[PDB]
Design a protein around this ligand. Structure first.
Ligand SMILES: N[C@@H]1[C@@H](O)[C@H](O)[C@@H](COP(=O)(O)O)O[C@@H]1O
Ligand SMILES: N[C@@H]1[C@@H](O)[C@H](O)[C@@H](COP(=O)(O)O)O[C@@H]1O
Lengths: 182, 182
């Protein structure tokens, strides 16, 4: 039952106004031309057998996941309309090489506005030098703007701030706080 | 058509294990006994006529909101299962006096785990001294733990860190970054 149906409408990524990109690419790549033998598209359940968790596990721990577990989560994300899990496939190898999620959050403030979040971004190690993290960040940042978000946020270590400033992000005055449940 | 149907199941707030509360209350209040003539419950569309935006507008700007706008947003939040917009009503006055949102975010990492977020917390000014922000933070923090989140996060100004440490939050090493779209 893992199939090729995308989590969200793929034309949203073609429709992204790439003239609004501010990151430097050499060579020039775009969501429509992401690089030699690469496709930038929404996640589908079939990516479970294209090494999706192999990419993700490079960011943090993915643990033990059943197929039914993965598909239950995928379906909930699709149904909400709020999740934009975006992958890069090397179509020569039939393998995911990069992933990133845009989450939309609906509010009542600012005249019932929407905000974006960048989550779970990781590029497979053997793809260093393919500019995919840059492409994913720029694409998703511009996607949220396309989806009428008033702002988009993310978290990173101070050492990596410079990277995100290139897509228009600045350091907030607010502290990021967290509680991990035991 | 604005009615009394809660955004989420209200028994979730009664079912919150309040023995796990770590905030200091004097007098002792709980989600079940939030204070004289107060009820702690999910938001319903009828709260539009109970001064919900009057409370919210004290946190930030709410702008101009149509009834149809408010109900479209409410319904999307209810449908996703991911939004826990929680209010305090003074039932003597028939008015909202406090609000806070728990957002659930579904991931694939950590064996398809869930994370919480605390958003849009505000207590009406005339309710200073009723311990409602403390009650809301503790309640929602414990609610996310109940809903099987592995962690919960929020953002605040450094000046306000001490307040949130009381519910188990610590300052992250990661910087909060933001882009506001023009
Ligand atoms: N910005 C990313 C998050 O999107 C990701 O979820 C997190 C994983 O870390 P953890 O495994 O501690 O939740 O790392 C970074 O902070
Ligand atoms: N933690 C709260 C957020 O939950 C809220 O959404 C924000 C509103 O600020 P703005 O109006 O700049 O989005 O204020 C704080 O940062």
């Amino acid at each position: 039952k893992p199939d090729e149906t995308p989590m969200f409408d793929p034309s949203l990524l073609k429709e992204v106004d790439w003239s609004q990109n501010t990151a430097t690419f050499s060579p020039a790549i775009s969501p429509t031309h992401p690089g030699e033998g690469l496709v930038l598209r929404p996640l589908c359940t079939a990516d479970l057998n294209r090494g999706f968790f192999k990419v993700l596990g490079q960011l943090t721990e993915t643990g033990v996941v059943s197929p039914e577990q993965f598909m239950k989560s995928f379906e909930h994300m699709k149904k909400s309309g709020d999740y934009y899990v975006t992958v890069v496939e090397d179509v020569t190898l039939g393998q995911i090489v990069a992933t990133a999620t845009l989450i939309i959050e609906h509010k009542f403030i600012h005249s019932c506005a929407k905000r974006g979040r960048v989550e779970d971004v990781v590029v497979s190690d053997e793809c260093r030098g393919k500019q995919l993290g840059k492409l994913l960040l720029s694409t998703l940042t511009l996607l949220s703007k396309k989806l009428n978000c008033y702002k988009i946020t993310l978290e990173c270590l101070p050492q990596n701030v410079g990277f995100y400033k290139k897509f228009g992000y600045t350091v907030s005055e607010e502290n990021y706080m967290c509680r991990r449940f035991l």
